[PDB]
Design a protein around this ligand. Structure first.
Ligand SMILES: *[C@@H]1O[C@H](CO)[C@@H](O)[C@H](O)[C@H]1NC(C)=O
Ligand SMILES: *[C@@H]1O[C@H](CO)[C@@H](O)[C@H](O)[C@H]1NC(C)=O
Lengths: 99, 105
């Protein structure tokens, strides 16, 4: 067809170097961080990953913000439903809006 | 302020800069325990004030989160909220009352 912009860029001595980490390695680091913060909590950022059930981890998180930890233990299904609904709303907003 | 749980730091002078010595707290030797969110006793649910419920296989203890220091589950380190019919994963145990030997003596 026609001459591209990038061929005219490269023919005049202007190149683009690739990054050191490929996107697979970025996704691997992101998956490792997600698996650590789901399975262990904040213990993997200070040393060895210490396993804990996720309900008890979220009870610790509620205890950190000034709410007593039983409020999760009588509202666990509602809190899980609210988290799933918010994740679905994020997915819908990313699929709809592109700006 | 370093990696770990920060305790203290010490400045040192360097050419065109500064050097910090961050003293941190790192957990070392781990162990596996069986845990529960609450303890059912006399139709009531007991949650720990500070700490976590653990079990070595036969008995149930309560210990702090960052160090293994087990102790007996009493009414002075647990609080009561509701019954046992709502909390998922509640186990059965007994809760010691310190007033019972003092009343009997
Ligand atoms: C705990 O159990 C897991 C699974 O059986 C095992 O891999 C691990 O070595 C055990 N010990 C510690 C200290 O995590
Ligand atoms: C705990 O005790 C109650 C009554 O004492 C009983 O209904 C319940 O099944 C017990 N829990 C388990 C896990 O056996």
């Amino acid at each position: 067809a026609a001459r591209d912009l990038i061929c005219a860029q490269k023919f005049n001595g202007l190149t683009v170097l690739p990054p050191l980490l490929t996107d697979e390695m970025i996704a691997q680091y992101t998956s490792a961080l997600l698996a650590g913060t789901i399975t262990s909590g904040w213990t993997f950022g200070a040393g060895a990953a210490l396993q804990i059930p996720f309900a008890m981890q979220m009870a610790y998180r509620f205890n950190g913000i000034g709410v007593t930890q039983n409020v999760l233990y009588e509202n666990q299904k509602l809190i899980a439903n609210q988290f799933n609904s918010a994740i679905g709303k994020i997915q819908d907003s990313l699929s709809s809006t592109a700006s | 302020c370093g990696k770990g749980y920060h305790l203290m730091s010490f400045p040192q002078s360097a050419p065109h800069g500064v050097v910090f010595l961050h003293v941190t707290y790192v957990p070392a030797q781990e162990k596996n325990f069986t845990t529960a969110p609450a303890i059912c006793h006399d139709g009531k649910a007991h949650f720990p004030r500070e700490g976590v419920f653990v079990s070595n296989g036969t008995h149930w203890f309560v210990t702090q989160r960052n160090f293994y220091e087990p102790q007996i589950i009493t009414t002075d380190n647990t609080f009561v909220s509701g019954n046992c019919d709502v909390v998922i994963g509640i186990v059965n145990n007994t809760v010691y009352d310190p007033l019972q030997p003092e009343l009997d003596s």
